[PDB]
Amino acid sequence: QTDRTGETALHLAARYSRSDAAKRLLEASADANIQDNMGRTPLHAAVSADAQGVFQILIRNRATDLDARMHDGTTPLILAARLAVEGMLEDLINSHADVNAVDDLGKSALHWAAAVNNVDAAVVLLKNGANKDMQNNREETPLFLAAREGSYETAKVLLDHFANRDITDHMDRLPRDIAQERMHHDIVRLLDL
């Protein structure tokens, strides 16, 4: 049963870090994948709440959909990269979440790590087979988004992984071009090295 935000008891257990409550619900065959009003499952809720105990319980539960999509296509892994929560991104990847899944705009977890300058997440994603040159629906690569947002440290990791700096967006702009337009002079310098 759902509340006014579409949350089940399991969503609430996640949001409030109630580990025993989570286990009893799952043992009673509570559906691990019910969506709230924004399409969040209890696993999205645990990532957003940084609820470590319930997070582990949910990823250890076989029937939990690790690649579940919010109503904008956001997965638990993309959410972990965006929010820069400790540990959870790597735990999801180790539990075999799809490193290359994308939201409804075509953005992977690596696109988002680049946009928010989550350098540690970019490193783990790349080490686990993330496509460094993936283009989203606007033809933007993670390097393009790092250059757009001024994410210097993540741009550097991407270049050290030999990300292709010549892949342009839908308007034929290079990462170097968007950095220049947005006055991210340190990135233009880095790209010119």
Tab-separated table of C-alpha atoms in Angstrom:
chain	number	residue	atom	x	y	z
A	1	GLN	CA	0.000	0.000	0.000
A	2	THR	CA	1.151	3.506	-0.961
A	3	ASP	CA	0.955	6.891	0.850
A	4	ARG	CA	0.445	10.463	-0.598
A	5	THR	CA	3.925	10.410	-2.213
A	6	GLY	CA	3.229	6.890	-3.645
A	7	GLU	CA	5.675	5.407	-1.102
A	8	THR	CA	5.277	1.891	0.290
A	9	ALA	CA	6.424	0.776	3.771
A	10	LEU	CA	9.603	-0.417	2.021
A	11	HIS	CA	10.214	3.067	0.563
A	12	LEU	CA	9.788	4.450	4.105
A	13	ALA	CA	12.148	1.839	5.569
A	14	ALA	CA	14.728	2.979	2.973
A	15	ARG	CA	14.146	6.707	3.507
A	16	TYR	CA	14.405	6.330	7.316
A	17	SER	CA	17.208	3.722	7.476
A	18	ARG	CA	15.053	0.980	9.071
A	19	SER	CA	17.048	-2.145	8.275
A	20	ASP	CA	15.067	-4.720	10.300
A	21	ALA	CA	11.802	-3.341	8.941
A	22	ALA	CA	13.221	-3.719	5.383
A	23	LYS	CA	14.223	-7.348	5.997
A	24	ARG	CA	10.853	-8.392	7.501
A	25	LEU	CA	9.030	-6.736	4.575
A	26	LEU	CA	11.240	-8.498	2.010
A	27	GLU	CA	10.858	-11.868	3.836
A	28	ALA	CA	7.065	-11.381	3.649
A	29	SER	CA	7.428	-11.064	-0.155
A	30	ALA	CA	6.956	-7.266	-0.264
A	31	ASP	CA	7.549	-6.123	-3.895
A	32	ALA	CA	11.077	-4.601	-3.944
A	33	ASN	CA	10.359	-2.651	-7.147
A	34	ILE	CA	7.166	-0.603	-6.552
A	35	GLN	CA	7.463	2.929	-7.941
A	36	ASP	CA	6.535	6.020	-5.943
A	37	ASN	CA	5.053	9.174	-7.614
A	38	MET	CA	8.463	9.998	-9.249
A	39	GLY	CA	9.122	6.388	-10.335
A	40	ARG	CA	11.593	5.743	-7.432
A	41	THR	CA	11.825	2.202	-6.097
A	42	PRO	CA	13.027	1.623	-2.518
A	43	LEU	CA	16.543	1.278	-3.955
A	44	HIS	CA	16.453	4.835	-5.455
A	45	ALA	CA	15.139	5.988	-2.033
A	46	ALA	CA	18.103	4.308	-0.205
A	47	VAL	CA	20.610	5.974	-2.503
A	48	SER	CA	18.941	9.408	-2.062
A	49	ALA	CA	18.795	8.958	1.742
A	50	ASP	CA	22.326	7.568	1.894
A	51	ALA	CA	20.751	4.718	3.854
A	52	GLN	CA	23.699	2.275	3.869
A	53	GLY	CA	22.050	-0.583	5.810
A	54	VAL	CA	18.829	-0.771	3.733
A	55	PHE	CA	20.881	-0.245	0.529
A	56	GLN	CA	22.894	-3.446	1.294
A	57	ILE	CA	19.748	-5.374	2.154
A	58	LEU	CA	18.148	-4.320	-1.132
A	59	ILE	CA	21.117	-5.092	-3.373
A	60	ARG	CA	21.544	-8.533	-1.652
A	61	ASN	CA	17.872	-9.254	-2.485
A	62	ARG	CA	17.906	-11.156	-5.816
A	63	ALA	CA	14.520	-9.798	-7.070
A	64	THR	CA	15.584	-6.123	-6.600
A	65	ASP	CA	15.890	-4.438	-10.022
A	66	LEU	CA	19.323	-2.789	-9.836
A	67	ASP	CA	18.634	-0.918	-13.126
A	68	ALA	CA	15.139	0.372	-12.145
A	69	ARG	CA	14.171	3.644	-13.871
A	70	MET	CA	12.575	6.740	-12.425
A	71	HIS	CA	10.097	8.599	-14.612
A	72	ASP	CA	13.021	10.493	-16.288
A	73	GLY	CA	14.929	7.167	-16.719
A	74	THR	CA	17.269	7.790	-13.727
A	75	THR	CA	18.768	4.479	-12.441
A	76	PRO	CA	20.225	3.838	-8.926
A	77	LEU	CA	23.720	4.025	-10.442
A	78	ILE	CA	23.077	7.395	-12.169
A	79	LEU	CA	21.568	8.705	-8.940
A	80	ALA	CA	24.658	7.563	-6.936
A	81	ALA	CA	26.978	9.272	-9.411
A	82	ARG	CA	24.884	12.489	-9.333
A	83	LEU	CA	24.630	12.624	-5.561
A	84	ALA	CA	28.268	11.639	-4.896
A	85	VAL	CA	27.204	9.228	-2.121
A	86	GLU	CA	30.054	7.163	-0.648
A	87	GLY	CA	30.411	3.501	-1.635
A	88	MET	CA	27.069	2.830	-3.291
A	89	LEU	CA	28.144	3.363	-6.906
A	90	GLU	CA	30.916	0.821	-6.547
A	91	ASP	CA	28.650	-1.641	-4.669
A	92	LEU	CA	26.024	-1.445	-7.481
A	93	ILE	CA	28.651	-2.068	-10.123
A	94	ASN	CA	30.050	-5.017	-8.129
A	95	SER	CA	26.497	-6.427	-7.935
A	96	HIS	CA	26.343	-6.217	-11.754
A	97	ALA	CA	24.186	-3.107	-12.383
A	98	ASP	CA	24.510	-2.047	-16.043
A	99	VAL	CA	27.381	0.500	-16.120
A	100	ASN	CA	26.235	1.733	-19.575
A	101	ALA	CA	22.464	2.179	-18.943
A	102	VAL	CA	21.192	5.642	-19.799
A	103	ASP	CA	18.395	7.928	-18.680
A	104	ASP	CA	15.755	9.327	-21.044
A	105	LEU	CA	18.138	12.009	-22.321
A	106	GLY	CA	20.740	9.397	-23.231
A	107	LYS	CA	23.017	10.225	-20.273
A	108	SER	CA	24.995	7.380	-18.626
A	109	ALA	CA	26.267	7.428	-15.044
A	110	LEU	CA	29.624	8.607	-16.534
A	111	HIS	CA	27.916	11.565	-18.286
A	112	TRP	CA	26.491	12.561	-14.900
A	113	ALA	CA	29.813	11.998	-13.039
A	114	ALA	CA	31.408	14.328	-15.635
A	115	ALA	CA	28.607	16.986	-15.295
A	116	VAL	CA	28.863	17.158	-11.471
A	117	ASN	CA	32.686	16.612	-11.362
A	118	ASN	CA	32.317	13.379	-9.358
A	119	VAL	CA	35.898	12.309	-10.159
A	120	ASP	CA	35.988	9.187	-7.896
A	121	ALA	CA	32.802	7.892	-9.583
A	122	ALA	CA	34.211	8.544	-13.083
A	123	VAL	CA	37.347	6.503	-12.116
A	124	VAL	CA	35.304	3.533	-10.865
A	125	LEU	CA	32.944	3.646	-13.869
A	126	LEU	CA	35.840	3.688	-16.367
A	127	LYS	CA	37.590	0.833	-14.526
A	128	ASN	CA	34.391	-1.188	-14.906
A	129	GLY	CA	33.819	-0.793	-18.631
A	130	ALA	CA	31.850	2.461	-18.971
A	131	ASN	CA	31.900	3.669	-22.565
A	132	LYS	CA	34.062	6.808	-22.290
A	133	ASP	CA	32.979	8.111	-25.706
A	134	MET	CA	29.222	7.488	-25.351
A	135	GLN	CA	27.030	10.193	-26.889
A	136	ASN	CA	23.719	11.265	-25.341
A	137	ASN	CA	20.655	12.405	-27.336
A	138	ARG	CA	22.247	15.838	-27.893
A	139	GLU	CA	25.432	14.071	-29.205
A	140	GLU	CA	27.338	15.103	-26.047
A	141	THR	CA	30.083	12.869	-24.634
A	142	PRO	CA	31.039	12.851	-20.937
A	143	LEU	CA	34.087	14.983	-21.883
A	144	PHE	CA	31.791	17.497	-23.609
A	145	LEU	CA	29.693	17.790	-20.401
A	146	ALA	CA	32.842	18.084	-18.151
A	147	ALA	CA	34.014	20.939	-20.487
A	148	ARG	CA	30.529	22.564	-20.431
A	149	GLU	CA	30.250	22.501	-16.601
A	150	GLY	CA	33.897	23.352	-15.782
A	151	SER	CA	34.548	19.928	-14.290
A	152	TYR	CA	38.304	20.124	-14.539
A	153	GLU	CA	39.316	17.081	-12.439
A	154	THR	CA	36.876	14.766	-14.245
A	155	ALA	CA	37.865	16.209	-17.697
A	156	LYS	CA	41.474	15.286	-16.730
A	157	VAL	CA	40.547	11.663	-15.801
A	158	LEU	CA	38.630	11.341	-19.117
A	159	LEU	CA	41.633	12.666	-21.136
A	160	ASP	CA	44.022	10.325	-19.254
A	161	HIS	CA	41.647	7.535	-20.368
A	162	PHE	CA	42.129	8.784	-24.000
A	163	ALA	CA	38.516	9.981	-24.390
A	164	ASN	CA	38.019	11.308	-27.922
A	165	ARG	CA	38.148	15.122	-27.749
A	166	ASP	CA	37.027	15.517	-31.396
A	167	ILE	CA	33.475	14.174	-30.915
A	168	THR	CA	31.188	17.200	-31.284
A	169	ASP	CA	27.640	17.886	-30.037
A	170	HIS	CA	24.525	18.285	-32.244
A	171	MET	CA	25.671	21.883	-33.068
A	172	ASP	CA	29.171	20.734	-34.131
A	173	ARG	CA	30.801	22.151	-31.004
A	174	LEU	CA	33.928	20.434	-29.611
A	175	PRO	CA	34.471	20.119	-25.813
A	176	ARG	CA	37.065	22.906	-26.379
A	177	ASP	CA	34.397	25.134	-28.058
A	178	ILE	CA	31.798	24.738	-25.292
A	179	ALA	CA	34.442	25.371	-22.583
A	180	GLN	CA	35.467	28.595	-24.427
A	181	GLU	CA	31.807	29.728	-24.800
A	182	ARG	CA	31.271	29.105	-21.095
A	183	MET	CA	34.535	30.768	-20.068
A	184	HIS	CA	36.099	27.621	-18.544
A	185	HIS	CA	39.576	28.797	-19.488
A	186	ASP	CA	41.404	26.186	-17.331
A	187	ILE	CA	39.699	23.409	-19.353
A	188	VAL	CA	40.498	25.050	-22.710
A	189	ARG	CA	44.103	25.145	-21.521
A	190	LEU	CA	43.967	21.469	-20.494
A	191	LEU	CA	42.452	20.451	-23.841
A	192	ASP	CA	45.198	22.456	-25.662
A	193	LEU	CA	48.010	20.658	-23.772
